[PDB]
Design an enzyme around this catalytic site. Structure first.
Site, PDB file in Angstrom:
ATOM      1  N   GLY A   1     -95.388   4.735 -44.332  1.00 36.25           N
ATOM      2  CA  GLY A   1     -95.913   5.672 -43.323  1.00 36.25           C
ATOM      3  C   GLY A   1     -96.175   4.974 -42.007  1.00 36.25           C
ATOM      4  O   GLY A   1     -95.363   4.160 -41.568  1.00 36.25           O
TER       5      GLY A   1
ATOM      6  N   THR B   1     -91.260   6.419 -49.509  1.00 30.25           N
ATOM      7  CA  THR B   1     -90.255   5.713 -48.668  1.00 30.25           C
ATOM      8  C   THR B   1     -89.751   4.440 -49.354  1.00 30.25           C
ATOM      9  O   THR B   1     -90.452   3.799 -50.148  1.00 30.25           O
ATOM     10  CB  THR B   1     -90.841   5.384 -47.272  1.00 30.25           C
ATOM     11  OG1 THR B   1     -91.421   6.574 -46.725  1.00 30.25           O
ATOM     12  CG2 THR B   1     -89.788   4.898 -46.337  1.00 30.25           C
TER      13      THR B   1
ATOM     14  N   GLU C   1     -91.979  16.415 -46.035  1.00 28.33           N
ATOM     15  CA  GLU C   1     -91.895  15.701 -44.756  1.00 28.33           C
ATOM     16  C   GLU C   1     -92.597  16.398 -43.602  1.00 28.33           C
ATOM     17  O   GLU C   1     -93.008  15.744 -42.643  1.00 28.33           O
ATOM     18  CB  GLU C   1     -90.442  15.462 -44.362  1.00 28.33           C
ATOM     19  CG  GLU C   1     -90.200  14.106 -43.748  1.00 28.33           C
ATOM     20  CD  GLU C   1     -90.244  12.991 -44.791  1.00 28.33           C
ATOM     21  OE1 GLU C   1     -89.431  13.028 -45.754  1.00 28.33           O
ATOM     22  OE2 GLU C   1     -91.099  12.083 -44.652  1.00 28.33           O
TER      23      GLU C   1
END
EC number: 3.4.19.13
Lengths: 183, 359
Positions: A84, A1, A40
């Site tokens: 996360g 991310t 994902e």
């Protein structure tokens, strides 16, 4: 991310968190096309039956928290982070330090963070005092023996009185803030 | 050299990679808007921070529109393919495939949304075409750039995973991880970006690339088909809003857990007047930890995609529910069995799902 943010002269503001899940996702690259594929769907619960179970055409629960704060109907702060489940905690702590504690934005971003989602899962950053960790563990917490970096907050503050922008990148990555002064 | 704090009169960019920040800034300098710049930045990060995001993934893009004064989220979160099953991550004994191996399986690959999200962003707010905005990233992919410390560390750390796929030819040339300062060249990615520049997003969601992606997912054990890619669309999500210390906070709704639990944790902690405690006092950390335990418990019990499941948002953020949760928190002792609350006490309806323990 990764999280990034942009603000322009016409008052548009973007706060954008984006990911392929794990670092390098599945590790699978589309042959001859160079595209790394996300993992994902492991963000779903592995054991079905609950709110975040796998279903076809369903989206796995995310923790991404791109956020914009407003004062007197104008956008004044953007916050977001990778990490996360820890994202919610990094965004929370940045807001707490900047607003509740009144810290300057860079200082708020750099203030050592903690994260814990359960009695068996704890993280803390370098700078959380050793005596505090001892005390809390004495009470039943389960902080470990070594620090880890938590999140990577990029943030923009907007001063509508003075017509200025401030951008901040978190030291946990090699990010850069670049202001625009036209002409 | 680049700075981690800057000020400007006419705009601002902040990203995790200096080359992406440079590209975004250049877009603004050349008269583009924040959305144009954000799209250019996503392509640049796809190249320069390739382990973290890109057209193989998805995201949440929150945009405040300076003309309409509306705040909108482009939700490009990936979708499970039509062939996904509730038990797809379980072995024959009905137990979870170990996480480190689970993430490498074709079943883990969601239908990617990022590119569709970028297209939607430009359709709504763009003043530069995708052809213009993707070009700087084509050049970084084709010509290369020297990798930073974070990328070098990532290649080293995940070398095993990368060695098992075609990714090895890019990140592990001649069987060894690229080091900090080494040139990363991504010719095939550059080509894919050129296809997107010429053909639009159909280059990705249809045709030979869609076939190749689907076949690859299937080769690695997943069910994704060309039809799944053709079917994909983003969703436009409405931000959830909260009041906090004189600010109005716009944040992300389900299918993210982020917004609900950011707001829930802020509302719980607001009762405690944290600033009364020194910023590094044990008291402050105690209150943070205890709050986190309560909110993450609720998250595990109640959050999922709202197209599918009844998330009790109203109950979870009800001021009386917040009060009940606050009252579970003490400075002088720790909740040793923190559990989800019952937000259904404070709203209508019920769950269309069970409480299922997870490994």
């Amino acid at each position: 991310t990764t999280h990034f943010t942009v603000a322009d002269r016409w008052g548009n503001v973007v706060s954008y968190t984006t990911t392929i899940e794990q670092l390098f996702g599945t590790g699978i690259m589309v042959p001859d096309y160079g595209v790394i594929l996300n993992n994902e769907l492991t963000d779903f619960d592995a054991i079905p039956g609950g709110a975040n179970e796998v279903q076809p055409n369903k989206r796995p629960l995310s923790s991404m928290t791109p956020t914009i704060l407003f004062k007197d109907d104008k956008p004044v702060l953007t916050v977001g982070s990778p990490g996360g489940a820890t994202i919610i905690s990094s965004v929370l702590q940045t807001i707490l330090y900047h607003i509740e504690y009144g810290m300057e934005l860079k200082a708020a971003v750099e203030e050592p963070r903690i994260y814990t989602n359960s009695m068996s899962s704890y993280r803390y950053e370098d700078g959380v005092p050793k005596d505090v960790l001892s005390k809390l563990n004495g009470m039943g917490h389960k902080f470990g023996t070594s620090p880890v970096d938590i999140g990577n907050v990029q943030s923009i503050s907007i001063d509508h009185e003075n017509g200025t922008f401030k951008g901040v990148a978190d030291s946990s990555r090699n990010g850069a803030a670049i202001g625009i002064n036209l002409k | 050299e680049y700075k981690q704090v800057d000020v400007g009169k006419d705009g601002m960019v902040a990203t995790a990679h200096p080359l992406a920040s440079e590209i975004g800034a250049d877009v603004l300098k050349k008269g583009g808007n924040a959305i144009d710049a954000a799209v250019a930045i996503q392509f640049a990060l796809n190249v320069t921070e390739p382990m973290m995001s890109g057209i193989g993934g998805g995201g949440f893009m929150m945009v405040y529109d300076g003309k309409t004064k509306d705040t909108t989220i482009i939700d490009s979160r990936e979708r499970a393919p039509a062939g996904a099953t509730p038990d797809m991550f379980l072995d024959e004994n009905g137990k979870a495939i170990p996480f480190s191996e689970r993430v490498t399986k074709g079943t883990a690959v969601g239908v990617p949304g990022t590119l569709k999200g970028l297209e939607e962003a430009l359709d709504k707010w763009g003043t530069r075409s995708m052809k213009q905005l993707i070009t700087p990233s084509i050049k970084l992919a084709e010509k290369g750039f020297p990798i930073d410390s974070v990328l070098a560390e990532a290649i080293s750390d995940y070398q095993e995973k990368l060695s098992r796929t075609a990714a090895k030819d890019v990140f592990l040339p001649n069987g060894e991880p690229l080091k900090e300062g080494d040139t990363l060249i991504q010719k095939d990615l550059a080509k894919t970006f050129k296809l997107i520049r010429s053909k639009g997003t159909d280059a990705f969601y249809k045709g030979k690339f869609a076939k190749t992606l689907s076949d690859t997912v299937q080769d690695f054990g997943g069910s994704m088909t060309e039809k799944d890619l053709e079917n994909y669309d983003i969703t436009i999500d409405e931000p959830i809003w909260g009041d906090y210390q004189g600010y109005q906070i716009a944040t992300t709704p389900p299918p993210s857990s982020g917004g609900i639990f950011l707001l829930q944790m802020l509302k719980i902690l607001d009762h405690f007047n944290l600033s009364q405690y020194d910023v590094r006092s044990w008291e402050k950390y105690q209150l943070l930890a205890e709050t986190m335990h309560l909110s993450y418990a609720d998250r595990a019990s109640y959050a999922g995609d709202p197209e599918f499941v009844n998330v009790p948002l109203k109950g979870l953020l009800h001021p009386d529910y917040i009060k009940e949760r606050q009252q579970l928190i003490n400075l002088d002792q720790v909740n040793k069995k923190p559990k989800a609350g019952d937000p259904w006490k404070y709203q209508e309806g019920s769950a269309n799902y069970k409480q299922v323990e997870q490994p």
